[PDB]
């Protein structure tokens, strides 16, 4: 089957309507009287009445102008019937192609397009892409789009910072001088022209591209002053010294604005540490390890600034990226102390009142503030000791008796104070412990002081020992003897050695009631040996 | 079978070519690979290559612009064959109608059109018709013509003598004053404009109509002079009298210029007749019947002019259509004549010499020229007659003898002349015949004059009769007698009567030779009777 040629109509016809197009008829009309009719969308189905057919002549016609963007192709079919109702021809397909006209301006999806580009990017850097669409036929000139830029705001540093690939709509940069710290955002008017951007024939329409310039690290941190000043006490470990104040021209609170300090020198021992204040962007220098004034009176330290992210290629590191802090140190008053802590001195027991035993040395760390050393009495339960403020020498007040309940253990303990005449007065407690050697200076006594027995000439009635306040050898074996005079006593009594320390006494008369006081000479070892005539009270019946 | 719609193309397309029109294809191409081709005049037959078909797509195209006036409709048919040579569709008819454009100016058959109109025809009179043709479609505006007049030469009496029925092209008159004797021919520029004579859109073209104004009888014949003069002799019958000279302002030698004269009066007797000179248009007056001067000395005749065809409606008959001719008549000398022609007069015979017999009357027609009448001798063989010039009276010269060989018959004939003393002298011959009565004036004689016989006394020897020169009764019976003396004769002889006219003589003596003269008296009747003695000579032996 040969196919009835399609009818090719341009849209937006001016008419006048009903505009006639074509005449379909059946050759069977040589003898039959036929009636024609079209069916289908555009004819009898919606949209109704666009295409009509003269029932007699078979002439086809359009009644209004067409619109390709509304309907592009109509599919009518044509009918043939004689006046007696017989179908004379099978319905036949007939096509109307509506041919495109350029009656649609290009349109942009958005009316505002957002894009961003980094600072000082090489000319040729892609930024963003803006595209329009055309409701007309893409396959025809009518729907083929070209792009260009109409205006840039603002016009600095160059009027034409950007361009646009007139087909793809890629906005690419063509100048240099994209500096956030000067012009932080550009607004562009993009224009779309169809008909392949033909100036006289093309229909045009615009949009906006807003390009924001994103920050980079191209400004170094710069200290507000060349030199800073701070103060620190001795022996402190968590105190702020100074606040280092900087300016960075980049974007606040970006890594490229955040400061990164380190102490380049002036503290070879690590007394200070540095941390960046998150909010204020300051160099907080803090004493991390304690300092000694008498080793260091002043600190002079250099400190270098930087950012968290590296600086840009061609930018200079200025002198103003380095400042110097002078740390003046405040000196404090401190405790005095002593060469030995518990000054040990050996000394014999019996000694004069007024003998200089030993001197007590005491010194002070404060080498730059010279002071009065105040030696004073503290705690000696015996009061045998004297000391003067200027000298610190120790002299005896009394005789030093080691067999005393004031010297419980073999040595005597004594405390002393050394005080500062400084505004905050300090003091240190010194000890003196002295070893007292036992000399034989105690006369032996008789132990059974009140030994009393009746008149029995018993072979061993009374046994006597010695009381001595001295330790070996100043006690040892004791000699027991009766005196020669009065003559009566050795005539009444007799003494016998047992071993060393124990001796017996017994009456050698044969025979009353009362008191008999019997003198006894007792001597102990330690030379020169001391004797004593301790009297024994005896009661006999 | 549904019929592929015809393709409707305007002629004179601007292209660009090859301009595509329609796409025919077979739906059988769903699986077959087809090849298309057109055939027919305009395709493969002459004219070749106007319409081509893309063998693959089936697209049809024109290659040059069309011309409706050259070919109006193309009848191509389209073919379909698969790549393996099979005919897939029966060839199908396809029609290109070339639609008309107005690209032809109207054309006139002739470039010069001839027509004629009579003088002073009523406004509305049809003259001629001029028509153009248009090579474009008559059924369309393009070939629909309108007419108008662009110019008239000359512009008098009115600029716009004619108009033209803008559709039929009939040139009809609209003014008055069509006067041949002023403007004899008009030239018209006719213009044809197509597009129904549309001034801005129509294409125009011209021709010429030359209108000649045909003559009518609207000018009367007018005599050059009020009066004319001529001269005529007496008794003439084919002589020209005068040439009547006229002017007619109409067209020479047309019936409306030809003169027609008649004599309205002045000649109640029909002496003159008038004929028109074919060439000179003159009134030739000719003497058709002879005239007599003595009855008419002068003629005064009025003569009316006219044309062969009647004069036009409103025109006046002038006085100058009537002239008057004075015919002066020249008088001629004419013959004189006589009251009686052969003047008969009775007269007795014997009459004196000098007797006035009768007078001869003679008269003359010339009543206005009085003349001398000249009576003269002519022919009389006897000379008995005399006549004098002044009187005309006749008197006798001699004695009038009727018995003469000069008057053979009973009467005497005599001729006479009467002559004119005029410059051309005329004359008339008069006759006079006179009856002469016989009187007895002749003496009788003897008839046998020489009767001679011998001497015999014979009873009847000599018989004698009479000789008389007169007729009865002046002869009649004659008496015969012998004289008394001499005495001897009646003694010798004797006379005897026989009857009347015859008598006998005889000698009565008894007895020689010689001559005997015998006298005899003889008398005749007519009174007074005359006798005579006639002698008879006788010889006897
Ligand atoms: C879009 O860009 C194209 C490619 O740069 C342009 O096409 C060129 O235009 C120049 C005119 O100066 C011609 O000399 C060249 O022949 C073109 N190059 C080719 C082969 O593509 C075009 O001008 C631009 N469109 C507009 C009007 O902006
Ligand atoms: C030819 O003649 C016709 C008939 O006279 C003209 O047609 C008329 O034109 C006048 C314009 O003055 C109109 O008002 C009338 O309506 C017309 N009459 C009709 C009904 O035919 C015509 O103008 C002439 N053509 C030209 C242009 O010369
Ligand atoms: C001062 O002298 C010494 C200081 O060492 C004291 O003697 C010590 O006493 C303690 C009792 O708790 C014993 O256990 C130690 O053996 C002793 N020290 C040594 C190692 O000798 C003494 O008590 C102090 N004061 C007195 C009362 O003398
Ligand atoms: C003159 O007289 C008469 C004129 O009539 C002549 O007589 C006639 O002569 C002819 C001869 O030819 C006769 O026949 C006639 O009878 C005569 N006339 C009549 C009627 O009488 C005559 O001849 C003339 N002349 C002479 C010689 O006399
Ligand atoms: C850019 O962001 C702004 C909001 O400030 C908005 O108006 C716009 O739609 C954004 N651009 C697009 C289309 O992504
Ligand atoms: C210095 O540091 C202290 C504690 O961080 C703060 O009180 C003070 O405001 C700082 N100086 C400035 C101006 O940042
Ligand atoms: C009119 O006659 C002239 C000759 O004088 C001639 O040129 C012309 O053809 C005639 N007109 C027509 C077409 O009859
Ligand atoms: C008068 O008529 C005579 C004869 O026809 C001729 O010779 C003469 O020329 C005429 N006159 C004129 C001027 O026609
Ligand atoms: C010794 O004994 C005698 C007993 O007669 C006594 O008198 C004397 O006082 C005694 N002496 C002493 C004190 O032993
Ligand atoms: C008569 O007769 C005689 C004869 O004798 C003669 O003498 C005479 O002369 C005659 N007369 C005549 C003349 O007759
Ligand atoms: C983009 O931006 C602004 C507002 O949307 C306009 O000035 C411009 O015409 C375009 O729409
Ligand atoms: C009719 O008459 C003459 C010569 O033919 C031209 O003047 C005029 O244009 C028209 O042809
Ligand atoms: C394109 O932009 C231009 C300039 O702002 C306007 O004229 C138009 O309305 C469209 O937004
Ligand atoms: C720190 O700044 C001081 C200025 O007082 C310099 O003397 C030193 O060299 C360092 O740069
Ligand atoms: C001496 O030392 C004592 C400790 O026994 C302290 O309490 C006193 O303050 C002084 O420094
Ligand atoms: C029609 O007549 C006009 C005027 O004579 C001319 O212009 C033209 O040539 C044609 O003959
Ligand atoms: C002929 O012409 C004459 C003029 O001489 C008139 O007298 C006469 O009446 C007639 O018209
Ligand atoms: C007399 O008549 C005669 C005729 O007999 C003429 O011949 C002559 O001229 C005259 O008129
Ligand atoms: C034009 O095309 C670009 C492709 O990148 C998109 O931005 C968007 O889809 C627009 O229609
Ligand atoms: C302090 O240190 C900085 C390092 O950034 C240098 O740029 C400057 O010259 C000074 O020595
Ligand atoms: C801090 O102080 C020290 C010494 O006084 C120097 O390094 C510097 O001049 C600053 O003033
Ligand atoms: C020494 O003396 C000072 C006061 O001067 C005290 O603060 C310290 O405890 C010690 O006894
Ligand atoms: C000397 O040392 C002793 C301890 O050995 C303390 O008890 C005294 O206070 C002083 O400092
Ligand atoms: C136009 O038509 C008229 C009809 O009278 C004719 O003169 C001639 O045939 C011309 O073509
Ligand atoms: C002569 O006769 C003519 C006749 O045409 C008259 O018109 C004129 O008045 C005169 O009588
Ligand atoms: C001819 O002559 C006669 C009379 O002489 C008149 O009728 C007229 O005057 C004309 O001159
Ligand atoms: C009368 O006389 C004339 C001459 O005067 C002749 O011409 C004529 O014939 C006749 O004899
Ligand atoms: C008289 O008449 C006769 C004829 O009767 C002529 O012969 C003669 O000439 C005259 O005229
Ligand atoms: Ca549209
Ligand atoms: Ca469109
Ligand atoms: Ca478009
Ligand atoms: Ca920058
Ligand atoms: Ca920075
Ligand atoms: Ca920056
Ligand atoms: Ca210290
Ligand atoms: Ca200190
Ligand atoms: Ca101190
Ligand atoms: Ca002691
Ligand atoms: Ca001791
Ligand atoms: Ca001891
Ligand atoms: Ca043409
Ligand atoms: Ca045409
Ligand atoms: Ca035309
Ligand atoms: Ca006229
Ligand atoms: Ca005339
Ligand atoms: Ca005329
Ligand atoms: Ca006459
Ligand atoms: Ca005369
Ligand atoms: Ca005369
Ligand atoms: Ca006589
Ligand atoms: Ca006689
Ligand atoms: Ca006689």
Curated annotation (Swiss-Prot), chains A, B:
Gene (name only): Cdh2
Parent-protein residues present: 160 to 701 of 906
PTMs per UniProt: Cleaved by MMP24. Ectodomain cleavage leads to the generation of a soluble 90 kDa N-terminal soluble fragment and a 45 kDa membrane-bound C-terminal fragment 1 (CTF1), which is further cleaved by gamma-secretase into a 35 kDa. Cleavage in neural stem cells by MMP24 affects CDH2-mediated anchorage of neural stem cells to ependymocytes in the adult subependymal zone, leading to modulate neural stem cell quiescence. May be phosphorylated by OBSCN.
Glycosylation, residue list: 31, 114, 166, 243, 413, 492, 532
Occurrences of domain Cadherin (ranges): 1-108, 109-223, 224-338, 339-444, 445-541
Assembly mode: Homodimer (via extracellular region). Can also form heterodimers with other cadherins (via extracellular region). Dimerization occurs in trans, i.e. with a cadherin chain from another cell. Interacts with CDCP1. Interacts with PCDH8; this complex may also include TAOK2. The interaction with PCDH8 may lead to internalization through TAOK2/p38 MAPK pathway. Identified in a complex containing FGFR4, NCAM1, CDH2, PLCG1, FRS2, SRC, SHC1, GAP43 and CTTN. May interact with OBSCN (via protein kinase domain 2). Interacts with FBXO45.
Binding site for Ca(2+) 2: 11, 69, 100-101, 103, 136
One of the record's GO cellular component terms: sarcolemma
UniProt remark on domains: Three calcium ions are usually bound at the interface of each cadherin domain and rigidify the connections, imparting a strong curvature to the full-length ectodomain. Calcium-binding sites are occupied sequentially in the order of site 3, then site 2 and site 1.
Extracellular face of the membrane: 1-541
Name the UniProt record assigns to this protein: Cadherin-2
Amino acids binding Ca(2+) 1: 11, 67, 69, 103
Keyword Metal-binding part of the UniProt annotation: yes
């Amino acid at each position: 089957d040969w196919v009835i040629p399609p009818i090719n109509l341009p849209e937006n016809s001016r008419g006048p309507f009903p505009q006639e197009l074509v005449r379909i008829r059946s050759d069977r009309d040589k003898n039959l009287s036929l009636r024609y009719s079209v069916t289908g969308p555009g004819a009898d189905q919606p949209p109704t009445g666009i295409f009509i057919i003269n029932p007699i002549s078979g002439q086809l016609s359009v009644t209004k102008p067409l619109d390709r963007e509304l309907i592009a192709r109509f599919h009518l079919r044509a009918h043939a019937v004689d006046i007696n109702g017989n179908q004379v021809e099978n319905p036949i397909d007939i096509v109307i192609n509506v041919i495109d006209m350029n009656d649609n301006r290009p349109e942009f999806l958005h009316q505002v397009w957002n894009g961003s580009v980094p600072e000082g990017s090489k000319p040729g850097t892609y930024v963003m892409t803006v595209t329009a669409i055309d409701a007309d036929d893409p396959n025809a000139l009518n729907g083929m789009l070209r792009y260009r830029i109409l205006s840039q705001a603002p016009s600095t540093p160059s009027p034409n910072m950007f361009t646009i690939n007139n087909e793809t709509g890629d906005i690419i940069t063509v100048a240099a001088g994209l500096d956030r710290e000067k012009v932080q955002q550009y607004t562009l008017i993009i224009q779309a022209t169809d008909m392949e951007g033909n100036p006289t024939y093309g229909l045009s329409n615009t949009a906006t591209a807003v390009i924001t310039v994103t920050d980079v690290n191209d400004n170094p941190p710069e200290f507000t002053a060349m030199t800073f000043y701070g103060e620190v006490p001795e022996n402190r470990v968590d105190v702020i010294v100074a606040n280092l104040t900087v300016t960075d021209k980049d974007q606040p609170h970006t890594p490229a604005w955040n400061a990164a300090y380190r102490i380049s020198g002036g503290d070879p021992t690590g007394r200070f540490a540095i941390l960046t204040d998150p909010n204020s962007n300051d160099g907080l220098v803090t004493v991390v390890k304690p300092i000694d004034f008498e080793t260091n009176r002043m600190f002079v330290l250099t400190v270098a600034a930087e950012n968290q992210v590296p600086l840009a290629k061609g930018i200079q590191h200025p002198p103003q990226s380095t400042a110097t802090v002078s740390v003046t140190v405040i000196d404090v008053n401190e405790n005095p102390y002593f060469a030995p802590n518990p000054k040990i001195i050996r000394q014999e027991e019996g000694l004069h009142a007024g003998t200089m035993l030993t001197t007590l040395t005491a010194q002070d760390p404060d080498r730059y503030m010279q002071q009065n050393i105040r030696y004073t009495k503290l705690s000696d339960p015996a009061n045998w000791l004297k000391i003067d403020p200027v000298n610190g020498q120790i002299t005896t007040i009394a005789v030093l008796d080691r067999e005393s309940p004031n010297v419980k253990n073999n040595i005597y303990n004594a405390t002393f104070l050394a005080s500062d005449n400084g505004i905050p007065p300090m003091s240190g407690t010194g000890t003196l412990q002295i070893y007292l050697l036992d000399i034989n200076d105690n006369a032996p006594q008789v132990l059974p002081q009140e030994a009393e027995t009746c008149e029995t000439p018993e072979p061993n009635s009374i046994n006597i020992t010695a009381l001595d306040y001295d330790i070996d050898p100043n006690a040892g074996p004791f000699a027991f003897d009766l005196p020669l005079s009065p003559v009566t006593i050795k005539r009444n009594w007799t003494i016998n050695r047992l071993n060393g320390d124990f001796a017996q006494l017994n009456l050698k008369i044969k025979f009353e009631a009362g008191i008999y006081e019997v003198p006894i000479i007792i001597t102990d070892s330690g030379n020169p040996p001391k004797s004593n005539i301790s009297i024994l009270r005896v009661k006999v019946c």
